[PDB]
Design a protein around this nucleic acid. Structure first.
Length: 59
DNA sequence: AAAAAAAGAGTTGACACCCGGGCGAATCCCTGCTATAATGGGAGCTGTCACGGATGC
């Protein structure tokens, strides 16, 4: 926890909250999984319904 | 020879409105807490000299 909580604050070079970075990681993971087990590339339209988030937020 | 008014000023009410300041509500950032066992690290030159200087017995 100490190594992961501090790596996302100083190494990023810009102020990025923890929830933002965790959402980015989850989105990247789900996008990679969908691109690997669904088709050629996951579109941002279906990423909102897959994660149950608004389109303006995922965009 | 005389003698009053469209403008020119001056206001007086009458809206049209346009950001400001609150009331909300909806939502960001921080911080800590997770209980099987985790126990010393990965590049990098190394195919230029030559000078001019800094350590050692």
């Amino acid at each position: 926890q100490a190594i992961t909580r501090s790596i996302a604050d100083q190494a990023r070079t810009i102020r990025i909250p923890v929830h933002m970075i965790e959402t980015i990681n989850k989105i990247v993971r789900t996008s990679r999984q969908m691109l690997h087990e669904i088709g050629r590339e996951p579109t941002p339209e279906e990423l909102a319904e897959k994660l149950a988030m608004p389109l303006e937020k995922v965009r």
